[PDB]
Structure formats: C-alpha cells, structure tokens
Amino acid sequence: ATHGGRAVIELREKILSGELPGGMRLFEVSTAELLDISRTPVREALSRLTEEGLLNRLPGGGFVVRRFGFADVVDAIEVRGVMEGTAARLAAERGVSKVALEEIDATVQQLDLCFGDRVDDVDFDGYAALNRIFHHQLAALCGSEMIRREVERASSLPFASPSAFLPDKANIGAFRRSLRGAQEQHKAIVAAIVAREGARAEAVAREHSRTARTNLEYMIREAPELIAQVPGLALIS
Amino acid sequence: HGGRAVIELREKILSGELPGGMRLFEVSTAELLDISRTPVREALSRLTEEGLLNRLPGGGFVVRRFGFADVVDAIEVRGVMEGTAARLAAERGVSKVALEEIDATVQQLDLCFGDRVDDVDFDGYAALNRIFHHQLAALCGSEMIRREVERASSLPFASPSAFLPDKANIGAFRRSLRGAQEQHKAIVAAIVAREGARAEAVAREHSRTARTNLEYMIREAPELIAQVPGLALISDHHHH
Ligand SMILES: [Zn+2]
Ligand SMILES: [Zn+2]
C-alpha cells in the first residue's frame, strides 16, 4: 500500500533471487538508484529488512546482505520452535479465554478436514494455508504483545516461517504423510494449554518445528530438486 | 551505533521525557533534539529495530508503552534464548579455547565476592556479568543463535545487567549475586559435560534472578524502580 512496503517487496525479491548476493554492502542512495525509487521508502525498507533479519547494519552506516548456509536454516527453524514452545507454555501457565481457545480449536477442526482415509490423502495446500493461521493464533494465545512480537520475529526469515517447508511443489507422498503426525501435535499443543500443562505444551510445540527440519533433511537426501522451492534456499544450494 | 543522536533519543525515551504513546516524526524530532536530520532519521530507525519505537502507518514513529508485565515477559524471552544458546553449546560441543575464555570470566566474577554474605563488588560484578552473557551467546559458534540472543537482550530492561546499576547496590541484591554466580558456574559445567537439558534449565532459571529482584523492588524498594535507567519509562499498575 505504501512506497516503503513496495520497496520491501522489491528489495526482498532481489535478495532472495541472489541479484543482491550475500556480503553485498547496501546504502540508501545507491539502493534507491538500483530500485529506481525515492530515498525515503528505501531507508524504511532497509531498516525493515534488518528487523526481518535479511540484512545487518554496518558500523559507520549502511547495510550488508546476510549470507546463509543449511546450518543457519536448521538454527532458524530451531529458534522458531523454541519461541512457539514459549508461546504455548505461557498460554498453559497463564490460562486462555474460552473465545480464544474456540478460535484456535476451529482452525484445528478445519485442519483435521484436510485428511482422508488413505495415509497420503492430505489436501497439502489447504493444510499449508490453515497451518499459517494456527501458528499465528498460537503466537497470540497467551495475550502478551511482547510474546506475540517475539514469536513473529523468530518466524520472519523466508525459510523460518511456519509453512515455508510446505511450498506447492513439495506436495509429494513423503511430505503429505508427515502432516499426520504434525496435525496430532497441533491437537496435543491445544490440549496441553487447555489442561494448564506448560511443560507438555512447550515440549510438543518445540518438537513440532522438527517436522520442517526432518523434511529439509528428506529434501537433501531424496529430493534435492525441491530445495529451490523453499523461499531463501535457492541461493544457499 | 548511530552516534550521539541514538544515545540522546534513547535517554529521552528511557527517562519518560518522550512518554509511551508519543508520536515522533523525523523533522520535528530533529528540532526537539537540536540535532541534524540525517543522524536523527537513522536513530529513529535504530530504535525501532531495538524495539523502543513502532513505525506508524503512513510514516513516522510511536514510543511503545510498557508495563511491569511487559518487563517480566522480556526477561523471560532473554532467559529462554540464553537457555537455547547454552543447550546448543552443550549438544554441539565447544572448543577448549572458547571454554577457557568463558571460564576466565567466571573466575574474575568469583573475585567479586568476599567472606561476608554482603561483601560483593556490585559494579564490578555487573560489568563482568555482561561479558559472561555475551560469551554464552557466542559459545555454540552459530551466528544465527548469537544474533537472536543479542536481539532478545536489546530492550533496556531485558539486558543481562539492566537491574544492576550503581544505584541498585542494596543488601538483597548483593546477596542475590552469590546464587547467580553459582548458576554461571553450573551453566559452564553443564556445557562441558554435554548435558543440554541441564544447560538449558539452569541458563533459563538464571534469568529469574532479574525477575525476582524486580518483584523485590516493587514490594520493598520502590524508590529503586525510578533510579534504574531501564525502568524509569515503565507505567505502573494504577497508570498502565
Ligand atoms: Zn504446524
Ligand atoms: Zn548472569
């Protein structure tokens, strides 16, 4: 909607495609010239992408495109899992309003409808979209804006987002099968929160993030053509 | 680090001179600080990245509002992230040189303590505590982990020695540093032993020292709250 927001989209696209490679130094004026836009939205975009974690600030001014390896991707997924586990634990310890529980339980019920009678019968893209909703609701459940922000910050890297490892091209039997266990975890997270069992809520929500890690390991081992389909992984490989 | 504009703007936010909910714009903020536009523009962006300001839709910024429950949540996030750094160092293994670096800090921290329970070099401990926590964030050797721990420690009341300014040198707090120092030793021992679950449990529990001391300030020393630079901006229960 804003010049700044469009600058963020264009700059993110250029970083993800490798047009602005890892290690490239970026400055407000020269980046505005490269994007063919005004200095002001570029200043905002460079700051927002530093908050997002695609860029680092340079000492003395300016920015630098971050470089990422597969070990960085694993660490980013682990941080998301740790923060989602914290949001689940605090919701369990503090208690959640019935309306907020009904909202997330409705998402869980819609997610159950993605599954059929055969093991690989899963509406993959439908699950990926509802999964995004479930994880946003989980981040907000305990009612703390400080917690919600931190969870969303830990989910902001292109490969760290909750459905990053569910791109449409990854709709294969091995990935569909893995969603059954992942959906049982969604149900267990909500049950643990309803039961006020914080240690369980944390353990399951953190373990849930290992589904994306295990699917990344599967891509490397058995389906390397899929690596380029996950946002941010094409340049790494 | 954005020079004097960042320092001046941060100081004004922390003292409550620019209160929570105040809208800030580049040009009018530069006029208020009597500083040129360029460093002020950069400072507003840096302080949004640090988490003290939010960007407004359509341009400009807004000072965030914080209550004591927000401070507790921020300390909890720092503890959770420090626990993650300790767990990953335990699981992955640390080079002997990196362990010797953090162990040297632990030994210097032990030198802060005398034979009487009250005998503690409070300011010396506060300074070396910052080094210990920065070293812990870096121990596993992952730049992703190090950057995230530092980001979770960027709010003024969330930093590892935020509650240890010179003006907070009181009996209950000096006495609390002894148990805190035993936790520093237990974190390192757990990492050396490759016991990740222990490393995480102790490092996360360590952050509850700042939480317990905040609860003590509210209950027994409310005069300290306003004298702790990172707590002056907090809105109390009656006003938040
Ligand atoms: Zn999920
Ligand atoms: Zn400490």
Author numbering:
A (entry chain B): 7 to 243
B (entry chain A): 9 to 248
Give passages from the manuscript.
The orientation B of the citrate was also observed in another structure of Atu1419 solved at a higher resolution of 1.75 Å but in a different space group (P21212). Here, two similar monomers (RMSD of 0.98 Å for all Cα atoms) are in the asymmetric unit and form a dimer, which in turn form a tetramer by the crystal symmetry with globally unchanged dimer interfaces (1553 and 701 Å2 per subunit for dimers AB and AD, respectively) compared with those from the P212121 structure. They resemble subunits B/C/D of the P212121 structure and bind similarly a citrate molecule. Nonetheless, their citrates are slightly shifted by 0.6 Å toward Arg86 losing the interaction with Asn221 compared with those in the P212121 structure.
